Amino acid sequence: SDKTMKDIQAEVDRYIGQFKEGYFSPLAMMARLTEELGELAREVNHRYGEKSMEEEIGDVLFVLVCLANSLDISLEEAHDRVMHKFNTRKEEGKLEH
Amino acid sequence: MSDKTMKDIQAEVDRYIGQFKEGYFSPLAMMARLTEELGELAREVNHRYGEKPKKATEDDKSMEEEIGDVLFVLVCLANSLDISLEEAHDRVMHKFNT
Amino acid sequence: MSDKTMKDIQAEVDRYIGQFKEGYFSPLAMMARLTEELGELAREVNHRYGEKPKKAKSMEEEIGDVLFVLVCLANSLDISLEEAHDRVMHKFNTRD
Amino acid sequence: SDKTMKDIQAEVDRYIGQFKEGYFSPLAMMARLTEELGELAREVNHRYSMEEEIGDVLFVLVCLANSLDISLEEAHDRVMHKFNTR
Ligand code: NA
Ligand code: NA
Ligand code: NA
Ligand code: NA
Numbered sequence: 001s002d003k004t005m006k007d008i009q010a011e012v013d014r015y016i017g018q019f020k021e022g023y024f025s026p027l028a029m030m031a032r033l034t035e036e037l038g039e040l041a042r043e044v045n046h047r048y049g050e051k052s053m054e055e056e057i058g059d060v061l062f063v064l065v066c067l068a069n070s071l072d073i074s075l076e077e078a079h080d081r082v083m084h085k086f087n088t089r090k091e092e093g094k095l096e097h
Numbered sequence: 098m099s100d101k102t103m104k105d106i107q108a109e110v111d112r113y114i115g116q117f118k119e120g121y122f123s124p125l126a127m128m129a130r131l132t133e134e135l136g137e138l139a140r141e142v143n144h145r146y147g148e149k150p151k152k153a154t155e156d157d158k159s160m161e162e163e164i165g166d167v168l169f170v171l172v173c174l175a176n177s178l179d180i181s182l183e184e185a186h187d188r189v190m191h192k193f194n195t
Numbered sequence: 196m197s198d199k200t201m202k203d204i205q206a207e208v209d210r211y212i213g214q215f216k217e218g219y220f221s222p223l224a225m226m227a228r229l230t231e232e233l234g235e236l237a238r239e240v241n242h243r244y245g246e247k248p249k250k251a252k253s254m255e256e257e258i259g260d261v262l263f264v265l266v267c268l269a270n271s272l273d274i275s276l277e278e279a280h281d282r283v284m285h286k287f288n289t290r291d
Numbered sequence: 292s293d294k295t296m297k298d299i300q301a302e303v304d305r306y307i308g309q310f311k312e313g314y315f316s317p318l319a320m321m322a323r324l325t326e327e328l329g330e331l332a333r334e335v336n337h338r339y340s341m342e343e344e345i346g347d348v349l350f351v352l353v354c355l356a357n358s359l360d361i362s363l364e365e366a367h368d369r370v371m372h373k374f375n376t377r
Binding site: 024025028031032034035036037038039041042044045049050089090091092093094096097 | 220227228234237240242245246247248250
C-alpha cells in the first residue's frame with residue numbers, strides 16, 4: 001500500500017531511462033538542486049516570512065532521488081547511515097521538467 | 098521479508114525529533130538548515146566528480162552521508178508541515194509522465 | 196576616477212532601502228531570499244553552460260540579483276564588503 | 292587608497308591568475324558558490340566571522356563574473372535601474 005523507498009527510486013529511474021539520455025552529470029545535477037532549492041526557498045519565505053509547498057518539496061526530492069540513482073546509491077541505506085549517527089548542444093535537458 | 102517505506106522514514110525521523118523538547122525548527126530556520134547541508138553535498142561532489150582537488154582518502158561512504166543529510170533535513174521540513182513525501186512524489190510523477 | 200567604489204555600492208543600496216522605511220529583512224528571511232536568487236542564477240548557468248535548458252534573462256542580471264541581496268545582508272549586519280574582501284584576500288596570501 | 296569595484300575584480304583576477312587551473316568552469320563555479328552559501332547559512336542560523344563567511348561568497352561570486360567577463364558594476368547598475376524604473 002505504501003511505497004518502499006527503493007521503489008520511488010525505481011519509478012524515477014523508469015522515467016529518466018525512457019529518454020535514453022542517462023542522468024545529468026553530478027555538477028549539473030547540483031545546479032538542479034540549487035535551482036529547485038531556490039524555488040522552495042521562495043515559497044517558504046512567501047508563506048512563513050511575511051498545494052504549492054507540497055510540490056516545491058517534491059521537486060527537490062525528485063532531484064535528490066535522481067542524484068541518488070545517478071551514483072547508484074540507496075537512499076534508504078543513506079538514511080540509515082545518518083540516523084545511526086544522530087542516535088549515538090550538450091544539453092539533453094529534454095529529459096526532465 | 099520487506100524494506101523501508103517513505104512513510105516509515107518520515108515517522109522514524111519524527112519519533113527521533115519528538116524526544117527533544119525543542120521539537121522542529123521554523124520554516125525559515127529549517128531552510129537555512131537545508132542550504133547548509135546542501136553546500137556540504139556540493140563541496141563533496143565538487144571534489145569527487147568536480148574540479149576541486151581529488152581527495153587522497155580512498156572511496157568511502159562520504160557521498161552517501163552527505164546525501165543522507167540533505168534527505169534528513171528535507172524530511173524534517175516535510176514532517177514539520179504535515180506533508181507526505183510519498184504523496185509529493187506522486188505529484189511530480191504525474192505532472193511529468195502524464 | 197569616477198568608477199563606483201564598493202563602499203558606495205553598499206551606500207547606494209542603503210539609501211534605496213531607507214525609502215520604504217520598513218527596514219532590511221531579517222537575517223534568516225534574507226538568507227532565504229539569497230538562496231532564492233542563487234538557484235535562479237543556477238538555472239541560467241545550467242542553461243548557458245550546463246545540460247538543462249530553461250523554460251518560460253541576462254546572465255549579467257542574474258549575478259546582479261545575487262550581488263544585491265548579498266549587499267543588503269552585508270549592510271543590515273553593518274558589514275564592510277570591502278573589508279570583508281581584504282580579510283579574504285589576506286587569508287589566501289598570508290601565512291604562506 | 293579606496294577600492295573601486297573593478298579594482299576588486301582585478302585583484303581577484305590576479306590571485307586566480309597565479310595558477311595554471313585558472314577559473315573553474317561555470318558549473319564547478321556554481322558549486323563553489325553553493326558550498327560557500329552553506330557555510331554562510333550556518334553562521335546566520337547559529338547567530339540569528341560573519342565578515343569572513345560573507346567575503347567568501349563575495350569572492351566566488353567575483354570569480355564567476357571574471358571568468359565570464361561580467362562587470363559587477365554594470366551588473367549592479369542594471370539591477371539598480373530595474374528597482375528604480377517601476
Ligand atoms: Na519547484
Ligand atoms: Na551534507
Ligand atoms: Na538571480
Ligand atoms: Na563561507
